[PDB]
Design a protein around this ligand. Structure first.
Ligand SMILES: NC[C@@H]1O[C@H](O[C@H]2[C@@H](O)[C@H](O[C@@H]3[C@@H](O)[C@H](N)C[C@H](N)[C@H]3O[C@H]3O[C@H](CO)[C@@H](O)[C@H](O)[C@H]3N)O[C@@H]2CO)[C@H](N)[C@@H](O)[C@@H]1O
Ligand SMILES: NC[C@@H]1O[C@H](O[C@H]2[C@@H](O)[C@H](O[C@@H]3[C@@H](O)[C@H](N)C[C@H](N)[C@H]3O[C@H]3O[C@H](CO)[C@@H](O)[C@H](O)[C@H]3N)O[C@@H]2CO)[C@H](N)[C@@H](O)[C@@H]1O
Ligand SMILES: NC[C@@H]1O[C@H](O[C@H]2[C@@H](O)[C@H](O[C@@H]3[C@@H](O)[C@H](N)C[C@H](N)[C@H]3O[C@H]3O[C@H](CO)[C@@H](O)[C@H](O)[C@H]3N)O[C@@H]2CO)[C@H](N)[C@@H](O)[C@@H]1O
Ligand SMILES: NC[C@@H]1O[C@H](O[C@H]2[C@@H](O)[C@H](O[C@@H]3[C@@H](O)[C@H](N)C[C@H](N)[C@H]3O[C@H]3O[C@H](CO)[C@@H](O)[C@H](O)[C@H]3N)O[C@@H]2CO)[C@H](N)[C@@H](O)[C@@H]1O
Ligand SMILES: CC(=O)c1cccc(N[C@H]2[C@H](N)[C@@](NC(=O)N(C)C)([C@H](C)O)[C@@](C)(O)[C@@]2(O)COC(=O)c2c(C)cccc2O)c1
Ligand SMILES: [Mg+2]
Ligand SMILES: [Mg+2]
Ligand SMILES: [Mg+2]
Ligand SMILES: [Mg+2]
Ligand SMILES: [Mg+2]
Ligand SMILES: [Mg+2]
Ligand SMILES: [Mg+2]
Ligand SMILES: [Mg+2]
Ligand SMILES: [Mg+2]
Ligand SMILES: [Mg+2]
Ligand SMILES: [Mg+2]
Ligand SMILES: [Mg+2]
Ligand SMILES: [Mg+2]
Ligand SMILES: [Mg+2]
Ligand SMILES: [Mg+2]
Ligand SMILES: [Mg+2]
Ligand SMILES: [Mg+2]
Ligand SMILES: [Mg+2]
Ligand SMILES: [Mg+2]
Ligand SMILES: [Mg+2]
Ligand SMILES: [Mg+2]
Ligand SMILES: [Mg+2]
Ligand SMILES: [Mg+2]
Ligand SMILES: [Mg+2]
Ligand SMILES: [Mg+2]
Ligand SMILES: [Mg+2]
Ligand SMILES: [Mg+2]
Ligand SMILES: [Mg+2]
Ligand SMILES: [Mg+2]
Ligand SMILES: [Mg+2]
Ligand SMILES: [Mg+2]
Ligand SMILES: [Mg+2]
Ligand SMILES: [Mg+2]
Ligand SMILES: [Mg+2]
Ligand SMILES: [Mg+2]
Ligand SMILES: [Mg+2]
Ligand SMILES: [Mg+2]
Ligand SMILES: [Mg+2]
Ligand SMILES: [Mg+2]
Ligand SMILES: [Mg+2]
Ligand SMILES: [Mg+2]
Ligand SMILES: [Mg+2]
Ligand SMILES: [Mg+2]
Ligand SMILES: [Mg+2]
Ligand SMILES: [Mg+2]
Ligand SMILES: [Mg+2]
Ligand SMILES: [Mg+2]
Ligand SMILES: [Mg+2]
Ligand SMILES: [Mg+2]
Ligand SMILES: [Mg+2]
Ligand SMILES: [Mg+2]
Ligand SMILES: [Mg+2]
Ligand SMILES: [Mg+2]
Ligand SMILES: [Mg+2]
Ligand SMILES: [Mg+2]
Ligand SMILES: [Mg+2]
Ligand SMILES: [Mg+2]
Ligand SMILES: [Mg+2]
Ligand SMILES: [Mg+2]
Ligand SMILES: [Mg+2]
Ligand SMILES: [Mg+2]
Ligand SMILES: [Mg+2]
Lengths: 138, 125
RNA sequence: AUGUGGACCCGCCCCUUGGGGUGUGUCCAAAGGGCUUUGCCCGCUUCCGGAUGGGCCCGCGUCCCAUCAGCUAGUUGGUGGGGUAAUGGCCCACCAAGGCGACGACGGGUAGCCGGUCUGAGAGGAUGGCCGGCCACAGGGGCACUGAGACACGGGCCCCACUCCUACGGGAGGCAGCAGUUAGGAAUCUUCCGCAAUGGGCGCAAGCCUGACGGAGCGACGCCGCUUGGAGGAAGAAGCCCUUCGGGGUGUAAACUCCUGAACCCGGGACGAAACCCCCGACGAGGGGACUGACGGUACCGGGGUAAUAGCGCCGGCCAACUCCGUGCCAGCAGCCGCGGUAAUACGGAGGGCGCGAGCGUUACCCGGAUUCACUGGGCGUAAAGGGCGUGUAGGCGGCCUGGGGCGUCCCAUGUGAAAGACCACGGCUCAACCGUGGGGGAGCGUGGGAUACGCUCAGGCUAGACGGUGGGAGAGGGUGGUGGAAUUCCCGGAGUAGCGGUGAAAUGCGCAGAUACCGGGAGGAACGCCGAUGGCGAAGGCAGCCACCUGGUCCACCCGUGACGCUGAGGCGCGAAAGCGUGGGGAGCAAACCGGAUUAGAUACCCGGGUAGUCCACGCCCUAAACGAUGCGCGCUAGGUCUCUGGGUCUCCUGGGGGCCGAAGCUAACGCGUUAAGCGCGCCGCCUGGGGAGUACGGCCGCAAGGCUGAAACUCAAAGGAAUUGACGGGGGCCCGCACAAGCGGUGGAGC
RNA sequence: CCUACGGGCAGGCGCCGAGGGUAGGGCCCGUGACUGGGGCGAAGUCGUAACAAGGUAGCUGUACCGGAAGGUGCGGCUGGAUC
């Protein structure tokens, strides 16, 4: 039935990027959109947009890579090197603000759902809150 | 296993098995020699290895190795056992400690003297 | 007797579990002593309040075995009593029929719990010794008395066991207080000094008691601090060791020269001690006064002063340190790998070297390394590991939109987290160890306030999941009944005659009671040739002549219906090849066992000839497997190409479902996998944790039995494994050579020499 | 026995009761005549099952048989080589 739509979304991204796709659709959810917003603001994706696929709500998601590279294998560096669920149906992970982790000494994000909305670690730490630790992206 | 599975079952802590009933772990146990035999090794070794079957205070009758150049042990000898298998001799899991009770320490031993239990010699010292 | 008051019953207010108040009625107090003696000091009574200490109850937390699965009859609740300071099945009478359990009851094992301690990057693991806190115990079992408080270590009673006294009637005793003795053991201290300090009991006080305590004694048992000297001092003594015979080492090390001066001797000499008490003041505040030291003639200060202890382990690799001799698979070393069989850096000694140093090694135990129980942080195609398959219970997990609640979650404030210990300052002992002061953290839990993204929940909505409807399909899916032809055996008939059969070769065997081969007829049993596939169907096992009936699944088209109705699934229940079992049929062919013949050194086999169970049917058991894709189920996501089975379309081509092959990205130890993943992700289940012992023993469950499921330990090894590499080998393959054999001609083996 | 005549004390009976006994159940250890296998130990005996088509492909559940490895039946697997 699809147990974790967020893990799904993340993985669609992980997969499309590994073959340098220009875009992926992912079935649309408000929650999903909020995570993308962060994702876009932080420059992991180009951006995203609502669309209908067989007349059903998706979110097309424009991916984004490095430049062409030199020697053998000139496949671009990836912008999303790593993207990975934390909290999951099997095992939710919640943090207080004092235990929000520093992802790759801050060269990476952690998206994070709080009662003051979905936030990155920095946004949420300055806003002084914690909550469900959704995923870490570097 | 899944998390739900760990929650239901958990992991199992691994019990470590004693190599040595000098009974209660106790670092040394005193006994009385019974047979002071010679035994041949196995595997790829050859020699005539000196051995005591020992009745212990701990209740156990066990076989122990008599280390050192040569020894002074006969059939009622009374000795301290220490643990330390011998490896070429099967079923020999303990050594006798030399220098204690009726196991005299090794004479003529200049080097590693404190194992073998032989006091400081006195010519250039 | 007095009753400030308090207690009880009844009532009434307030308050809400038995908390305050109030009104009749009843009931309850007391002790005296001392004086520097008319006014104080110590006491006594009742009441209310505080302080301290406790009892009871509750939430949460607190080890191993499920090879302990069901436990309970004061049991569970109730009404009324009793008992208590007090609640309560704490106890009792009666009533009801209850209580607990896989979220692990009941049972067994093991253990005092904690603050802490050790370890670890942390998470975690181990631990509860000193010190502090709580419990429990006082030779073993019970019991109550007294009392604010005990069911009372040095109080009482009784029973039990042991020791001592005994005039045999009876008694006495309880070091898990301080010392100390003995026994056990690898092993654990003085029958010391003192109440001077701190604390404790009684006392108006003086004081008395205090093995609490403060000290000292003994053990390198640990930690810290310090000594065994310091500066000169040779191209370099001797001795010992190497040597390529030239030289090298020990080595500034020593001898020797200055210098300092642990030990030891002389002198002074503590802090810890100001209070209790007495005097002035008032017996209060304040002031004055006197006593008091176990440690100890110690610490510490001053004068003098002697060069004055070094050991243990290691030197093959892991690991820092190499040579000569001795030794010859011996003696021995050995943590693991392994050394030793005449040149051993591995054994023993020497020299030399490395490491620590009043210590150094050993054994034992904990954590570490071990991401080797993996939460952080592992795995299951072939290495250990996917349950034989399903159905589905509990449980776990759950698509999109809106609103309510705020249980999880997050935030703020606050109470709590004692002391010690831990972290950081600054201080005290010459330092440190040890210690004083101050600061800082700190999981967890309580109370009040707030947030609402996600999780939960309540209510509402949707249609992408799921299910359903209409129409169309392919199929060895299953069950029952029927039926067809070929073949084998047997029986009858004809014709026919000397063998058939069988093997490497044979023989046993069958055949003149006429076999074999051939034709005709009949009986029966079992199995379905071509089609047939690299095919199809089923969840697995597994399913194949044809027909009919009954019946399970599943695919496509329309996009009509319901509205998250979903996934997974411990246990349960069902299915489950062959062999095997029971009862009863049946029995052609085949065929364990068995009876024979060959072969062979032997042949309890391979080959041949017989042949019973069985193989077949029905019903009932068994429940296993190389039950294999050796690959759990479900869902989403990530190039293609090619062949095939089966739907639909606008039928060159497009679009579903299924079976193969090659292969993107990617993964893999490799082999390989690769939209039919072993790729990328989520959910839920099952399983693994070195090899052998062992799928054994024990126990339980099941079974008619055979057996099946579950499943150890002792002991023992340093591997056991997987994939791939190079070879080598094959009574594997292909290609090919050589007087290798074949074709030839002459020899040797015989005789003499 | 004491009494202020209210009662108290002795004493007696009873319930509970440590422990004791008898019969039946269970559980834990010892010790054991006799018996079954197992590990380990340079150079003992019989064959040769397996590894190369191991000279009968192997392995496997099961059933029977046999000094021993094993062999045979039936069914399964390829984790069999040779075209
Ligand atoms: N072992 C192979 C199979 O694992 C299967 O399930 C597992 C796999 O599907 C998958 O595991 C993946 C693995 O596929 C793939 N090779 C990559 C990944 N490392 C693994 O993931 C797993 O392990 C990592 C840690 O290594 C975890 O962080 C992660 O959460 C966990 N899913 O997710 C499951 C997690 O164990 C089935 N159990 C069975 O088919 C078989 O056991
Ligand atoms: N509380 C005041 C004093 O504090 C001390 O606590 C402190 C000291 O014990 C200790 O501090 C000192 C440190 O300050 C000083 N700068 C260095 C010294 N190594 C530390 O000492 C500590 O550490 C070492 C090793 O860990 C050990 O000797 C021992 O654990 C302890 N002495 O750690 C704490 C913080 O510095 C005492 N433990 C305590 O008995 C005393 O009261
Ligand atoms: N072939 C018939 C079918 O087989 C199944 O089972 C039946 C038969 O197969 C089975 O065997 C029959 C038997 O009926 C009858 N009493 C004896 C007869 N010889 C048998 O005959 C059948 O089976 C055997 C098996 O090889 C053969 O003869 C042949 O294959 C077939 N005709 O016995 C069952 C009933 O007696 C199904 N039950 C049914 O569909 C149908 O009878
Ligand atoms: N190894 C334990 C088990 O039992 C047997 O193994 C034991 C005996 O069979 C085997 O015996 C062998 C023998 O077969 C072989 N042909 C001759 C050899 N001398 C024997 O050797 C045995 O005995 C000698 C004394 O004679 C010992 O020195 C030696 O340790 C041991 N290997 O040696 C084993 C010693 O344990 C089976 N081989 C095997 O099933 C299984 O591994
Ligand atoms: C085959 C051949 O020449 C030959 C020669 C002598 C004796 C044998 N004996 C044979 C003997 N008949 C044997 N059978 C056999 O080989 N067949 C082909 C039937 C039998 C089972 O014992 C054999 C296998 O032992 C054998 O082949 C020898 O091995 C065969
Ligand atoms: Mg994608
Ligand atoms: Mg908090
Ligand atoms: Mg050797
Ligand atoms: Mg009054
Ligand atoms: Mg009165
Ligand atoms: Mg009551
Ligand atoms: Mg105990
Ligand atoms: Mg660790
Ligand atoms: Mg503990
Ligand atoms: Mg007692
Ligand atoms: Mg008590
Ligand atoms: Mg006493
Ligand atoms: Mg003794
Ligand atoms: Mg005192
Ligand atoms: Mg005092
Ligand atoms: Mg000097
Ligand atoms: Mg001088
Ligand atoms: Mg070295
Ligand atoms: Mg040595
Ligand atoms: Mg030599
Ligand atoms: Mg060595
Ligand atoms: Mg040596
Ligand atoms: Mg670990
Ligand atoms: Mg893990
Ligand atoms: Mg592993
Ligand atoms: Mg395996
Ligand atoms: Mg399977
Ligand atoms: Mg299911
Ligand atoms: Mg369910
Ligand atoms: Mg949801
Ligand atoms: Mg809340
Ligand atoms: Mg504290
Ligand atoms: Mg200082
Ligand atoms: Mg709180
Ligand atoms: Mg709804
Ligand atoms: Mg005929
Ligand atoms: Mg099959
Ligand atoms: Mg519709
Ligand atoms: Mg509707
Ligand atoms: Mg069956
Ligand atoms: Mg059968
Ligand atoms: Mg039968
Ligand atoms: Mg035969
Ligand atoms: Mg035959
Ligand atoms: Mg036959
Ligand atoms: Mg496949
Ligand atoms: Mg396909
Ligand atoms: Mg492929
Ligand atoms: Mg094992
Ligand atoms: Mg291999
Ligand atoms: Mg090879
Ligand atoms: Mg020739
Ligand atoms: Mg001749
Ligand atoms: Mg009485
Ligand atoms: Mg032996
Ligand atoms: Mg064979
Ligand atoms: Mg062959
Ligand atoms: Mg063989
Ligand atoms: Mg063979
Ligand atoms: Mg078989
Ligand atoms: Mg046979
Ligand atoms: Mg077979």
């Amino acid at each position: 039935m699809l147990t974790d739509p967020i893990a799904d979304m993340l993985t669609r991204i992980r997969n499309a990027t590994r073959v340098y796709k220009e875009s992926t659709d992912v079935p649309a959810s408000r929650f999903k959109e909020e995570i993308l917003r962060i994702l876009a603001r932080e420059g992991f994706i180009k951006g995203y947009e609502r669309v209908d696929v067989d007349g059903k709500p998706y979110l097309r998601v424009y991916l984004k890579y490095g430049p062409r590279r030199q020697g053998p294998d000139p496949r671009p560096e990836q912008v999303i090197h790593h993207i990975r669920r934390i909290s999951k149906p099997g095992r939710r992970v919640y943090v207080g603000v004092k235990e929000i982790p520093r992802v790759r000494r801050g060269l990476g994000i952690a998206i994070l759902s709080t009662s003051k909305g979905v936030l990155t670690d920095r946004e949420a730490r300055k806003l002084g809150v914690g909550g469900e630790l959704i995923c870490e992206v570097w | 296993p899944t998390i739900n599975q760990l929650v239901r079952k958990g992991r199992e802590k691994v019990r470590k098995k004693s190599k040595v009933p000098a009974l209660k772990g106790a670092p040394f146990r005193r006994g009385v020699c019974t047979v002071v035999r010679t035994v041949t090794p196995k595997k790829p070794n050859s020699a005539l290895r000196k051995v005591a079957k020992v009745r212990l205070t701990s209740g156990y009758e066990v076989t122990a190795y008599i280390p050192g150049e040569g020894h002074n042990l006969q059939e009622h000898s009374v000795v301290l056992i220490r643990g330390g298998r011998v490896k070429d001799l099967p079923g020999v899991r303990y050594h006798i400690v030399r220098g204690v009770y009726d196991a005299a320490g090794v004479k003529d031993r200049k080097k590693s003297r404190s194992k073998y239990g032989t006091k400081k010699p006195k010519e250039a010292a």
